[PDB]
Design a protein around this ligand. Structure first.
Ligand SMILES: NCCCc1ncc[nH]1
Ligand SMILES: NCCCc1ncc[nH]1
Lengths: 348, 348, 348, 348, 348
């Protein structure tokens, strides 16, 4: 027996929806859910979604609290809906998916993913839940994650990191690296070879290779010399050029993290959502150098070096396609006299 | 187990809260409660109260659906709260009382009127509900209504009419005339002798005596002659004077109803609530004669004639107090040479 | 190039969306759309839907302005969505369907009904629009209306009335009687033989047969005598019993219209939407007789007489299923000694 | 000392702002102003304007309660703002003008119309207020109304009717016919000779000449014969043609009032404001004949007959400009063989 | 003469309500109060309370700006209301109490605490205000704070810290340590022996004893050895166990502060209010170890050591009650073979 008061009871006593019986007094005002605690109203939830406040509150309470794939991975794999869970999108403060299956009476399109309404949708299945590997085997369209091997199915090793309650982390106490599987029209897909973005933050950026440690510690000319990067325009692309009114390059998160230690800058996240490539309106506070659309990707510096060193540098401009997070990312590569001028994730 | 979904289930299936088990999906957006009916949202309630939308919806669903005293009578008797019911104020589209007793977890100050918090409040008790006469006997402060005799308790015969689902009526299939009782500080109070307002509408006004039939049918000068009303200023007070920019008199509802048949006028109800005396900003459409504060009372014309004919007409101006609906209504009486000039409910 | 300003330009200059080029300044505040007219804001639309204000405004502007089936008929036939039009539900002040096809970028699930997303949905097709009969022939699920014969397709003669801009009418200058067709899972479905509700209002009720003229003019006992209705409980079912606290019978709109001429009553439409059977919380103003859930259906009195006279009256209680507006309506029939006690649309 | 609480005190005790000292407790929630009356909240004002709720409440409380020109006349004369008053637009439930002069601290652009900010604005002045004729004489731009002669100023006799608290009326107890004067760039402007619209409603339409009495009582062919209107297409223009899907003509309010007595129709006022010519999306309920943009003007039938009989009928199509309510109204006149086919206020 | 404009004038010129005369222009939009400063709107207050925006703005302006007891202390002492002040709850951004006494006309239940409505309520009295010690002496129910001795009354030494404008601090320039007194039904209570929580923040945690300095500086095994804490499960309870998917222990704020220096973690404050024990949904960013309901108390480590070393360790599980901040806190104590396994504030 689902109810607003029961959802609020679960949030108050269990920190989230935990199927417990009970009710607390609730008041809804505008887009906020409150509960009465000893005579006064205490805020439980502020709706930042486009769904009705009581519906968003229920989906948020019913969010998956285990490490789950980051929303950008699910989106890149064409995931439409999740089987009997809510993947909460912490970047948008909203459900990752419009509809649900066996979660909430207002958003449910089905109670089980075997209902014919789900057959054309790519349903997310989680092998850590009993019966979901079997549901994926019988589903026409779906994406499955598992911690280990699935008999007969060939896996795709996913990223090392996963999202746990909005914290992206590489699990030590929990497993965050999943095997991925995908089916389109009843046929198990062969997921492509892919690089993965590292999902790091600017303020707490940590290197994940000796090359990344060297990038952060060494001076620009020492690093470029050590890794034989002359002619690859890392001065522009990675370090950034703050000498003109338009900020040059600065498309790799590691370069922004290095700059951030020396001096701050504003990053306007004008489309705030999870995506493989992010676009920011950047203003460098020290110089006043700025760029309306600065595309930024967090690749491991070694992967970015491998990508740029695997390109033909004989044409003025061309599109370089790279599978990253299972999706095809277009980069614009500009060359002159056999050397790179710029290389950036395409603002298409 | 009270819940928003259960309240909505009761509204959808029973027309109001009826203690039935069940749930319907609900969505709350802004101040409106909706339910899903075959794929689309259907409005169940629009909150016009100052309470949270889900709380007002529950109180409205739990409204008393038996004939109950009109809110003006309850207000006049000093009723603060009701015992285990909601008196819905249809004139304000809101609960008649801020708090509840044994109704709703958000508004309840107690579950039973015997709780010490209720002792200073004048609690409304309904003798038609088992145990409520006994609860009145043990209450420090309260107002009780009954359909019959209570042993040892001296009654006050209330008005003929009561409100049933917002319709004021004199019951034929149901009893609407109640005995009234009141207690203050543990002591039974003698309710005063009183007139009662008739609670009629302008558009569907019906006469309730031969004098009222004669007022509506006869011309002004022949009605005044027939009932020997010369010198009582009925021309001004009751018929109304539309000859000057300021509308003169027009303080009896019957006079407004007579005028309404001939020509329309605007009545701005600038304090829209139930009260013994109503104030309107009136604009006569035919003449343009208007008055910002025109006090209007719906007394039976015979009662108004009895009141005005029982006054001493020897002083220029004085306050005449008349008990109406259990409250002392102040009237301003203006005389000249032994005749009335005006008589109106005194604008406080 | 669709835009809020272009939609508002069309509303201001064409009375609705008419595909015209142009823009007017618009301001959105809360749930209302305004436009500037010579310096001041003028309201164009107040959103009463659960969709975003600018989206609801666009769907309302793009509403079908030809006579279309009443929403209750579309709901009864299982219509989920319309092909390249918006059926505006004037009873709910909202789109009849959640999603659109080729109408609005925010609500569209497809641009054409041939897209695979539309295959499981019952799409409404209108033969008066070029190519829509062909689209119905190729659709997996759908309901089609036409003004004439479709080769090889067996028709179902629909109701005489249709809705034109929220006015239900039997067209004289326009055709409102359509042929109906339906497909389920790619297979043309035979629509059942059905009665149709008359879609009349209480305040402007007009008789549509000599029996209905006689019901409204004749006294109860002489109408029952003239039409040999003794033993069919029309006194209870149709005329209504206002003698007890619970209002008895009163399930036919014509009986409510007859009562309405004599004395008024309140009809609380607690689920305000279009449906074959309506439920009202009724309070009779004259007697105080009331009923929380009074099911009411507007059948032609002759059709109701035909239905009730075609039943076996030998059992205490039973369910009688009658096809009305293409839906199976359950009725509860209560008998005693070979006579009817009551017959009413069964409260589900 | 202006304040929200003082404005509310004035509304509660005086029916509007009357400069009285005092305060009442107020609560603002969403767009509604409430006051506490014996423990419960009572609604004083619901903001339907695009201004902040407390600001709109103050302007509405400070509305002019004397007969004032109808907003369409003020708009037609180019009035931007009023001197030390608020002209409340009852058709829009909003101030007729965005800014104020000496009324409200939030909307004031000046305290007196002599401030240089008012020089480019056409300020409305009211000769019934002391000093306002002198203020008009010194204003660069303005419109003045008076009840009598202003020395040396040539007057324009305005309409017979004025708006008093939202009621348009021809005053008997008050004067509603004003002399009008206008200044542009410091120069007194000669107001043109004009017809005036009658400002009548469909439901309470009253004839104002013997020709109008004859139009409403006589049959179409005998009225046309009596007034020698053969060849002037009154059958189409005034009576209306309900025979085709598109409703023909019906551009004079009197014709809509005649039709209304026989059968109802829907008039969608899609730009709800006061204007000389109104546009409606009309749906005739009896026939289903409809028109998205039906321009309607309320001229005295005699004035419309005078206008149409003063035109040259020798050209297929042409624009006929007629001064109505001080504005040039364009009409489209279509002729064939020396007879009128149609004549309507040209849809701009 | 209280008013919205006067409250706003005080906020603009005095930083809070200071009883100064004056008015500023104000606009209210949604839940925000603005004032016009040289032509533009400037935000003064955003309502995060469940009260009307203008009422919450007034109570916030009238907040107590002296050091006052933290809301958790007032709540633990059963405080219902304050005498002639507003205790602003900075953790909820709302008044600590629903009603007021002599503060605001919308929330006042009385002007003075001697009114009979206040007699059953526990009124907060402040000895720093003239006459409030005497008001406490005559009150039936109340809590009094003083800086020094009250003749005849025995004091309870309160916490060292108090809240000054939402900053919890141990005053050096001001006195924050108060004597507490409480009366229930006219009887001066003997307040129990109690520990006090330290009200520290995670980010700016400072040790308040040599044991706390040693906890933060020393390694886990060195500290446990130095203070002879073997067998008391400090490894689990205080340091925290981040090795399993469920985060173990971590119930003392000092342990969270130590962890915070090494690596960050998310603390979801799902019931955001002031309380002796706080519950957080914690996610450790380094390991991914998490716990839905991690109860956390900020006790001085010496007090926690004294509490845990004063328990009988011979039973598997039992409830240990400890008076903290004047309230009874239940702890769950789990033992095995004479050693502690866990000890935590009970999630009841
Ligand atoms: N954000 C949801 C993506 C779902 C999808 N992918 C392709 C089509 N639909
Ligand atoms: N948060 C207010 C507490 C007041 C109280 N304590 C006990 C009863 N009421």
């Amino acid at each position: 027996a689902m109810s607003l008061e029961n959802v609020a009871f679960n949030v108050v006593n269990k920190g989230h929806f935990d199927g417990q019986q009970g009710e607390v007094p609730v008041s809804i005002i505008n887009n906020t859910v409150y509960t009465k605690v000893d005579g006064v109203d205490v805020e439980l939830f502020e709706n930042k979604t486009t769904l009705p406040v009581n519906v968003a509150f229920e989906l948020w309470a019913k969010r998956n609290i285990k490490p789950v794939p980051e929303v950008k991975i699910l989106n890149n794999l064409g995931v439409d809906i999740a089987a009997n869970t809510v993947i909460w999108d912490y970047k948008r403060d909203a459900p990752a998916h419009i509809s649900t299956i066996g979660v909430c009476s207002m958003t449910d399109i089905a109670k089980k993913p075997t209902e014919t309404i789900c057959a054309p949708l790519t349903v997310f299945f989680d092998g850590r839940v009993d019966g979901q590997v079997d549901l994926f085997r019988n589903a026409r369209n779906g994406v499955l994650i598992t911690e280990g091997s699935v008999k007969g199915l060939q896996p795709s090793v996913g990223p090392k990191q996963a999202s746990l309650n909005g914290v992206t982390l590489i699990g030590e106490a929990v497993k965050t690296q999943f095997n991925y599987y995908k089916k389109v029209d009843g046929v198990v897909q062969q997921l492509p070879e892919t690089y993965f973005t590292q999902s790091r933050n600017l303020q707490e950026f940590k290197p994940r290779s000796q090359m990344e440690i060297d990038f952060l510690e060494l001076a620009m000319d020492e690093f470029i010399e050590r890794y034989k990067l002359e002619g690859y325009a890392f001065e522009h692309i990675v370090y950034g050029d703050f000498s003109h009114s338009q900020l040059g390059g600065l498309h790799l998160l590691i370069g922004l993290a290095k700059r951030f230690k020396e001096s701050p800058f504003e990053l306007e996240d004008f489309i705030p959502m999870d995506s493989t490539v992010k676009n920011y309106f950047i203003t460098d506070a020290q110089t006043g150098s700025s760029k309306c659309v600065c595309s930024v990707i967090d690749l491991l510096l070694d992967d970015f070096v491998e990508i740029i060193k695997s390109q033909d540098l004989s044409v003025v401009s061309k599109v370089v396609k790279v599978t990253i997070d299972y999706t095809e990312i277009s980069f614009m590569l500009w060359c002159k006299d056999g050397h790179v001028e710029t290389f950036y994730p395409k603002l298409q």
